[PDB]
Amino acid sequence: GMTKYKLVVVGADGVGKSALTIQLIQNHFVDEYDPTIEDSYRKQVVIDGETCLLDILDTAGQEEYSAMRDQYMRTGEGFLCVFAINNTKSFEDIHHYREQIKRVKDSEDVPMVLVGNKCDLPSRTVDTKQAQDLARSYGIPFIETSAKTRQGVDDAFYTLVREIRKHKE
Ligand SMILES: Nc1nc2c(ncn2[C@@H]2O[C@H](COP(=O)(O)OP(=O)(O)O)[C@@H](O)[C@H]2O)c(=O)[nH]1
Ligand SMILES: [Mg+2]
């Protein structure tokens, strides 16, 4: 038991939190998935020749008390902050998610990746540069993804893992 990585997926409702995690774990794209469902997913992967286990909480951000939600927030090593490129509101909402993570971790150095999802859609409302600058503002990687095509799906989770390794040394 050498390396396990605890990852948390956060972001506005309907940006593709669920779709992204399932696409990663089950290698399929989900049409519909209950927006109120918050669950943890485990899968063994090799990343850069190093076999490790990913332990990934897909957040739904409901109100009811969860002991598991709390555990992941406190012990979680890295966070995906997801918006959608066709959803200007979800992009504007990123800052709320960043600040909560800062508070939870009580630090400015928290492994994170900015992810722009639904990049397979022509109706973009959020420019590469827009997202690029925010991620630059935060000093974090920005990756464009599609849960429907798998574009960037591996790079999003793997980049985050790599961010976590840099935090280890
Ligand atoms: N075209 C497209 N649709 C997506 C993508 N990711 C998610 N969706 C769709 O967007 C909707 C919301 O996704 P969901 O995973 O439920 O979002 P969540 O609320 O953040 O968990 C669903 O109808 C998905 O099929 C994507 O990359 N491309
Ligand atoms: Mg969901």
Side-chain angles (χ1 to χ4, degrees), residues 13-19 29-31 117-118 120-121 146-148:
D13 188 49
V15 300
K17 291 171 276 154
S18 288
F29 169 65
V30 69
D31 48 358
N117 191 47
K118 308 196 187 186
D120 56 298
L121 291 178
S146 173
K148 177 158 178 158

Side-chain angles (χ1 to χ4, degrees), residues 36-91:
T36 77
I37 288 181
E38 181 174 289
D39 192 23
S40 75
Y41 288 75
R42 293 149 197 106
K43 197 182 178 190
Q44 196 175 294
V45 291
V46 185
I47 310 177
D48 304 335
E50 166 197 286
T51 201
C52 53
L53 263 94
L54 298 180
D55 189 6
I56 314 170
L57 175 74
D58 173 39
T59 66
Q62 301 286 116
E63 191 282 311
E64 313 283 1
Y65 166 63
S66 176
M68 172 177 85
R69 187 188 304 152
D70 280 349
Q71 187 77 23
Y72 275 91
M73 279 321 240
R74 197 192 85 282
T75 52
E77 289 164 88
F79 301 75
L80 284 184
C81 300
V82 184
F83 70 95
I85 71 150
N86 75 313
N87 183 351
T88 288
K89 192 76 138 188
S90 76
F91 178 72

